[PDB]
Design a protein around this ligand. Structure first.
Ligand SMILES: *[C@@H]1O[C@H](CO)[C@@H](O)[C@H](O)[C@H]1NC(C)=O
Ligand SMILES: *[C@@H]1O[C@H](CO)[C@@H](O)[C@H](O)[C@H]1NC(C)=O
Ligand SMILES: *[C@@H]1O[C@H](CO)[C@@H](O)[C@H](O)[C@H]1NC(C)=O
Ligand SMILES: *[C@@H]1O[C@H](CO)[C@@H](O)[C@H](O)[C@H]1NC(C)=O
Ligand SMILES: *[C@@H]1O[C@H](CO)[C@@H](O)[C@H](O)[C@H]1NC(C)=O
Ligand SMILES: *[C@@H]1O[C@H](CO)[C@@H](O)[C@H](O)[C@H]1NC(C)=O
Ligand SMILES: *[C@@H]1O[C@H](CO)[C@@H](O)[C@H](O)[C@H]1NC(C)=O
Ligand SMILES: *[C@@H]1O[C@H](CO)[C@@H](O)[C@H](O)[C@H]1NC(C)=O
Ligand SMILES: *[C@@H]1O[C@H](CO)[C@@H](O)[C@H](O)[C@H]1NC(C)=O
Lengths: 261, 235
C-alpha cells in the first residue's frame, strides 16, 4: 500500500516490494513510469511469477483521469512485453490475501516507436499488423494480412445518416467515388448488401448525377466476384441510392406458441 | 435472476454460457457468428489463456447437453475494453472471438446492436435471460430462468445507489420493491429490450450490490455508447 512510486529515466530496474521474499498481502502498490514528451514506454519483463486470477497487474496508460488499459498479466510464465503510447505508463498491482507469491521485475527503457514496427514509406500500404503490401492486396480479394486490414472495408455510404442506407460510394484501390446503375440488378444488389454487412436489397433506384467522380461500372458474372471498371464514360449517370434492409437480427426464428400464463 | 421463470426452449437463442475449464462462470450474448460480447468483470485476469475458455452455443438445459442444438466452440482471443476500470466499475464489457464459424441454426441466432442516437426510455417492460441464481446464498438453476425487469433513470439509480459513481455509460434496471433482480453467476447477461418486433442489446450485466433487495437494482453497462467499438471487431 506504501511501496514505490513514480520513477524517471536513470532508475530503471526495480522489483515490486521485495524480490528475495514474498510480497505482503492486501497490498495495492503503484509505479507511475514516466518519460519525456513524445517518448513511449516499454515494459519488458525479465522475471514474472505471480498467483492466479486473484492476483493481477492492471497495467494502465492513463496520463489523466480517463485511464486506458494495455494488458492484465497474471500467473507464471514469460509474459509478453507492453508498448505504451503516451509518456506515462501507470502500473497498478492488485493482490489477494491468500497464497502470496514472490514478485517480478521490470526494465523500462523509453524511446520512440518501440514495439510498433516502423512503417515502410514510398507507396507501401501498412496493414494493422505491421506487414507491408504496396499494391498486391489493396482491396482486391485476398487475405495476405491475417488481421484483415488488407481486405478491409474499402466501401461506404454518403449522406446515409441511418445505418443501412446511403450512396454507392466505392473505392477501387485509393480514391473513393460513386458508381453507375446501367446494368444494376437484384443479384449485384444483394451482393453489395452482403459485402456491406447488411441484409437484402429492398428498393434500388437512382436520384440524379451529383458529382463527376470516377464512377465504376458494376457487372455480374457466374464466377462469384463482381466485375468492376472505373470508366469515365456515362451520360446522365444514375447514382445508386441503395435501400438495403438489415440482416437476420435478434428476432424469434423458432416456432414458439402463444401461452400467456 | 432470482425470481425468474423457466423459458421456452428456443425463446432466447442469443444467450450462451461461458465455461472456464469445464465450469460455468458467466454468461455472454452472441452478436456475430464469431464474436461474442460478455462482461469484463469475469474475463479480467483470464484472457491470457483463451484455450481454457469454452462457449456452448444454443444451450438451454445443461443436463440436456446431448441434444444436437448445442454447438460447442473454443475461444482463441479475448479483447477487454480499453476504458475498463475494476475499482470504479466502469465500462465492464469485453468481446470474445471464436475459433471456427457457426451456422445460424433454429436455436442459434445473432442479436441486434443498439444504434447511435437511440435512447431507451425508462419504465420500459423488457426481460433478460441467463443462468440466474434462484437464491443469493445457494446455487443457480439448471434451466434458463428469466423475468421482466423495467428500466430506470440514471438520476433515480444514483439516488438509490450512492455507493457507486453512476456515470452516463451505465444504465440501471430493477424492481422498485426488489424481489426479482440479477444475482451472482449471471454476470454478462444481456438486457434484451424489444424494439419494433426486434430485440436489441440495451445492457450487459456488470455487477450487483445485493440481489433481490428493495431499492437496490443492478447496474448494467450501456451498450449504446460502444456500438462502433463492438462493430469494429465484427468484420
Ligand atoms: C533514483 O533513485 C535514487 C535513489 O533512491 C533517488 O535518490 C533519485 O531521486 C531517483 N531519481 C532520479 C535519480 O532521477
Ligand atoms: C533491461 O534489462 C534486461 C536484462 O537482461 C535487458 O535484456 C533489456 O535489454 C533491458 N532493456 C529493456 C528491457 O528495455
Ligand atoms: C450530401 O449532402 C451535402 C451537404 O453539404 C451536399 O453538399 C451534397 O450535395 C449531398 N450529396 C448528395 C448526393 O445528396
Ligand atoms: C448493360 O445495359 C446496356 C443497355 O441496356 C446493354 O446494352 C448492355 O449489354 C448491358 N451489359 C450487361 C453486361 O448486362
Ligand atoms: C422494405 O421496407 C418496407 C418498409 O415499410 C417493409 O415493409 C418491407 O417488408 C421491406 N421489404 C424488404 C424486401 O425488405
Ligand atoms: C433430454 O431429456 C429427454 C427427456 O428428459 C431425454 O429423453 C433425452 O435423452 C435428453 N437428451 C437429449 C435430448 O439430448
Ligand atoms: C454450415 O453450412 C456449410 C454450407 O454453407 C456446411 O458446409 C457446413 O457443414 C455447415 N456447418 C458448419 C458447422 O459449418
Ligand atoms: C410490466 O410487467 C409487470 C409484471 O411483469 C407488470 O406488473 C407491469 O404492469 C408491467 N408494466 C407495463 C408498463 O407493461
Ligand atoms: C463522480 O465522479 C465525478 C468526476 O470526478 C465527480 O465530480 C463526482 O463528485 C463523483 N460523485 C460521487 C458520488 O463520487
Amino acid at each position: 500500500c506504501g511501496g514505490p512510486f513514480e520513477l524517471w529515466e536513470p532508475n530503471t530496474t526495480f522489483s515490486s516490494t521485495n524480490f528475495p521474499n514474498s510480497y505482503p498481502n492486501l497490498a495495492f502498490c503503484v509505479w507511475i513510469l514516466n518519460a519525456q514528451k513524445g517518448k513511449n514506454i516499454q515494459l519488458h519483463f525479465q522475471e514474472f511469477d505471480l498467483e492466479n486470477i486473484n492476483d493481477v497487474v492492471e497495467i494502465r496508460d492513463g496520463e489523466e483521469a480517463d485511464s486506458l488499459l494495455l494488458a492484465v498479466y497474471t500467473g507464471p510464465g514469460p509474459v509478453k512485453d507492453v508498448f505504451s503510447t503516451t509518456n506515462r505508463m501507470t502500473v497498478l498491482l492488485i493482490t489477494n490475501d491468500v497464497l502470496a507469491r514472490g514478485g517480478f521485475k521490470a526494465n523500462f527503457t523509453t524511446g520512440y516507436h518501440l514495439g510498433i514496427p516502423e512503417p515502410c514509406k514510398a507507396d507501401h500500404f501498412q496493414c494493422k499488423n505491421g506487414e507491408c503490401v504496396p499494391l498486391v492486396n489493396l482491396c482486391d480479394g485476398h487475405l495476405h494480412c491475417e488481421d484483415g486490414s488488407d481486405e478491409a472495408d474499402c466501401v461506404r455510404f454518403f449522406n446515409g445518416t441511418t445505418n443501412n442506407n446511403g450512396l454507392v460510394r466505392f473505392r477501387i484501390q485509393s480514391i473513393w467515388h460513386t458508381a453507375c446503375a446501367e446494368n444494376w440488378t437484384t443479384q449485384i444488389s444483394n451482393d453489395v448488401c452482403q459485402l456491406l454487412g447488411l441484409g437484402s436489397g429492398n428498393s434500388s433506384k437512382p436520384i440524379f448525377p451529383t458529382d463527376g467522380g470516377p464512377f465504376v461500372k458494376l457487372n455480374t458474372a457466374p464466377d462469384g466476384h463482381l466485375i468492376l471498371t472505373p470508366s469515365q464514360q456515362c451520360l446522365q449517370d444514375s447514382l445508386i441510392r441503395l435501400q438495403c434492409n438489415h440482416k437476420s437480427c435478434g428476432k424469434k426464428l423458432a416456432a414458439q406458441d402463444i401461452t400467456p400464463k | 435472476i432470482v425470481g425468474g421463470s423457466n423459458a421456452k426452449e428456443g425463446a432466447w437463442p442469443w444467450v450462451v454460457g461461458l465455461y472456464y475449464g469445464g465450469r460455468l462462470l458467466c454468461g455472454a450474448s452472441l452478436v456475430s457468428s464469431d464474436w461474442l460480447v460478455s462482461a469484463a468483470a469475469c474475463v479480467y485476469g483470464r484472457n491470457l489463456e483463451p484455450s481454457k475458455w469454452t462457449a456452448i452455443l444454443g444451450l438451454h438445459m445443461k443436463s440436456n447437453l446431448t441434444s444436437p442444438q448445442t454447438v460447442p466452440r473454443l475461444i482463441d482471443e479475448i479483447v477487454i475494453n480499453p476504458h475498463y476500470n475494476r475499482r470504479r466499475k466502469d465500462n465492464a464489457i469485453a468481446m470474445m472471438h471464436l475459433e471456427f464459424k457457426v451456422n445460424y441454426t433454429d436455436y442459434i441466432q445473432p442479436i441486434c446492436l443498439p444504434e447511435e442516437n437511440q435512447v431507451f426510455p425508462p419504465g420500459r417492460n423488457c426481460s433478460i435471460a441467463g443462468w440466474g441464481t434462484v437464491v443469493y446464498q445457494g446455487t443457480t438453476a439448471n434451466i434458463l430462468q428469466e423475468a421482466d425487469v423495467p428500466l430506470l433513470s440514471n438520476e433515480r439509480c444514483q439516488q438509490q445507489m450512492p455507493e457507486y459513481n453512476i456515470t452516463e455509460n451505465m444504465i440501471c434496471a430493477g424492481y422498485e420493491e426488489g424481489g426479482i433482480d440479477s444475482c451472482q453467476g449471471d454476470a454478462g447477461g444481456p438486457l434484451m429490450c424489444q424494439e419494433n418486433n426486434r430485440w436489441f442489446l440495451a445492457g450487459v450485466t456488470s455487477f450487483g450490490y445485493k440481489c433481490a433487495l428493495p431499492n437496490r437494482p443492478g447496474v448494467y453497462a450501456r451498450v449504446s455508447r460502444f456500438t462502433e467499438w463492438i462493430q469494429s471487431f465484427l468484420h
